[model samples]
Target chain A: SAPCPQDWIWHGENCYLFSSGSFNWEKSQEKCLSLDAKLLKINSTADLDFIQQAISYSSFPFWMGLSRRNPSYPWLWEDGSPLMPHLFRVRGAQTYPSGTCAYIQRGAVYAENCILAAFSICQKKANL
Target chain B: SAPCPQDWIWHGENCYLFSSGSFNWEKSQEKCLSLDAKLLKINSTADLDFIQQAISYSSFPFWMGLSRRNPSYPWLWEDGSPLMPHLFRVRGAQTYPSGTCAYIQRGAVYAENCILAAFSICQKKANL
Candidate 1:
């Protein structure tokens, strides 16, 4: 039977890791890579919704792999997908234009400096 | 430890029952009541989002406890909460004005005949 690794969560066909470590966006990505995973990429509206609920149970803020080089560029995720507004709209993109990096604060997605630190949420396929 | 009954699912603070039998909306509610559960009430945006994902994994449509007596009245859930468009909008309410009943047809909420039969998803607080 396919199952998730110890300490990881299985939802549908994928496994997720809600890390306890605090790291900047880049370092967070590195940490996830070390675990054979990557920072969270909202693959669907369903994923976005589930995430809002899942993290509502936590007080910790978690890094999401959403960023743009600058406000002039489009936001893209670690999985090489653009932030589709139809799926979810990140708040403070215009107000906090300096924060190209993104993280989930419970139910809302916020943009902040990539240098700031927060816990990370990672995702990968379940083991076969 | 608190646990769900056989075939019931534990999510957050409650257990859910995704029925295998098909029944009309009214009968569905009755069946859930007999099981000591109730039709879904979408307690939060998080719940709405999670349900969208959880139900997407199913091939069957599900009767949600949502309706209004007629087109002139506001839609209300079984729990007495008004249909909040800020949370999520129900489709076909305008097109099928006569269909006061609602159900989850994959990702979308559609208005249809209450007399029509579909699977039901019931919910209640899990054991202490």
Candidate 2:
């Protein structure tokens, strides 16, 4: 039943790092990498809502694995898959141009440069 | 573990109905009996404390399994088991008049008329 790693918790078939702190986008993703996870990937509306309640006002802003490689690139996941605008059309578009990263705030994704500080939400599969 | 019955709630080794319903003392007992349970029985100090939080300020007065046939008789449980002073005896100094039945209030048992209306806290094994 405890399929999730310690310090990581479960939401559906995935475990996430809502562990205790914040970091800039690069550090957050790299930290999750060292812990064998990817930064948070919002797969569905359910994931967004679950994380909304999980974070609440407690962890105000947390980085998602959403960012663009360069000015010409649209927002993409760590896997390089472009985001589906139907699930979200990143608010505050090009809130800052190049290196635009997305993180959740009040349940909505907002764009910002990758260097800004925010807590991490790492994601990985829970061994079923 | 399995959360027992959907409508019933949990405590170690048992499930209880602290359902949103109330009935008179005998009727409470019958309702529980019909559900294959006994009326709420405080088996230990721990049981009282657990129910204290469960009932809290919400279900203030709920029926217990204690009662007696007449005023002249000593208090007894529905099982014919007499009160154990080591646990808890009656509250409010032999409180109600004739037909003195007891129910839980603020985690203490108080004598009351069997026909008095109060919520039921049905109890039964965890069905293990």
Candidate 3:
């Protein structure tokens, strides 16, 4: 019906949308909120799979919830975890120590090369 | 399996792979060749449908084989035909009178605003 309708990823009582477009973390967060959703609050594999399908078109990277915006506070995902053991659908997140924010780049779906841009996608409750 | 497996599109006798990664038209063509294929040589509704599924992720514009590399030569598709009345999957290709290339930008698959980058994908013959 609508061109590329926004599919809000609904999990638990919270809904998340991954913007589906490539933009910095701050801007991505802003856009998500504008759509009445917040930056993805990923907490499980289901969250990973949803983002994977939504962003299947791009091979580039986009902002995610993980970041060290407050260096002393330690890096955390939108869900507020300390990036324990397993994270990311493929091999945990890549750490760029100096960067203030964390992001996920699918690496072109072929050949392990990170891309620069891809839109955002999000998820929310079905009832909403 | 592979991270993002290469999905080749099989048409008549030709095989195509849209690259599924963003790059310029010339570069996209080169990439297709690297995969033992060429810039998408679309010819039917089935072909359009195949691309739609493959690139459902991002909302950016990308280079297609539909180009007028040679100005006076008139715009033509990879199949070597003039711009027909019904040329694009959605509406027709946007004609930039002063430009020499013809490309398809899905416009983020939403909002109807064209995107700048998204990967490529292609299709080829199964027998090959």
Candidate 4:
């Protein structure tokens, strides 16, 4: 991405920006890209757990590097893996597998839209 | 279901119960089968974002794994396909011919509810 920025740490092949700022999926991705990096890409629970540990330890809902690709591209992690979106019996409404998106909702919720706004963690580079 | 216990933590197949603990959607799957290897079946997004940063961040709000199963048994996630739930009209209502379940509202939230309660991340099999 940006070759790595100071004040940031590198994990595996990515850099993480740990901020308490909140944002929706779209805005979150924008924040990451604006800094020359994409949002954090989670590949496994350990990876995500590490990120979580690096920042949050209170078990509060925190945003991640994801968002809706389109109104129909379906929800996916920054890594491009499709999440298994399912519906509850109380949710009443539902759509196709391509209409969903991923975002950290109000209060750090992670199943809302990706365009809201909140603290964010950009990922340029650790040396940039 | 009670094969791994003691300070818990197996982080492989299931069991995630942290104390900020919350529940919903069939009582967090009966508290992850009253404790065994159920609930906590995230495959990616860094394993549900490392169980959402192992608790939560100031992003404030938290929850994980998911909920809402019957009414048709569509909302899946104990592992596998499905999870494309979409549609956001606001305070209104809609239906796919399905429902939803993933709790974490009224404060710390994650998606919605998974048997709505609070405090989880239970794992069994850590030197068990």
Which has the greatest lDDT?
A: 1
Tens-place lDDT digits, model 4, residues B35-104: 6545554445545555554444433333334434444454455555554434111111123322454433
Q: How well is each residue in A1-128 modelled by candidate 3, as lDDT tens digits? A: 11112223233444444444566555666787677655554566666665565456556565655566443456676667765446443223332334465445563211111223334444444332
Backbone clash total, candidate 3: 48
Q: B1-80 in candidate 2: lDDT tens per residue?
A: 34345434456777777635667887778888888899887877788777775654342688888887777788888888
**Candidate 3's residue-wise lDDT over B43-118, tens digit each?**
6666666555445554555566666543345556677876555635333323233334444445322111123343
Q: Give model 4's TM-score versus the native structure.
A: 0.36
Whichever of 1 and 3 has more TM-score, that candidate is 1
Q: How much DockQ does model 3 earn? A: 0.07
Per-candidate RMSD, Å = 12.5, 10.9, 12.4, 17.4
Listed models, DockQ each: 0.02, 0.04, 0.07, 0.06
Instruction: Compose the digit string of candidate 2's lDDT tens values, residues A56-126.
Output: 42426788999986656787899988776688778876444338899887677888888878877888887
Indicate whether candidate 3 or candidate 4 has the larger lDDT: 3
The window of 10 residues in a row where model 3 chain B has the poorest summed lDDT is: B1-10
- Chain A of candidate 1 compared with the true chain A, TM-score: 0.89
Interface RMSD of the predictions, in order shown? 12.5, 10.8, 13.3, 15.4
Task: Write the number of the candidate with greater lDDT, choosing between 2 and 4.
Answer: 2
**lDDT for each residue of candidate 4 in A9-68, tens digit (9 for 90 to 100):** 555555666554665656666767777777665556555555555544344334565545
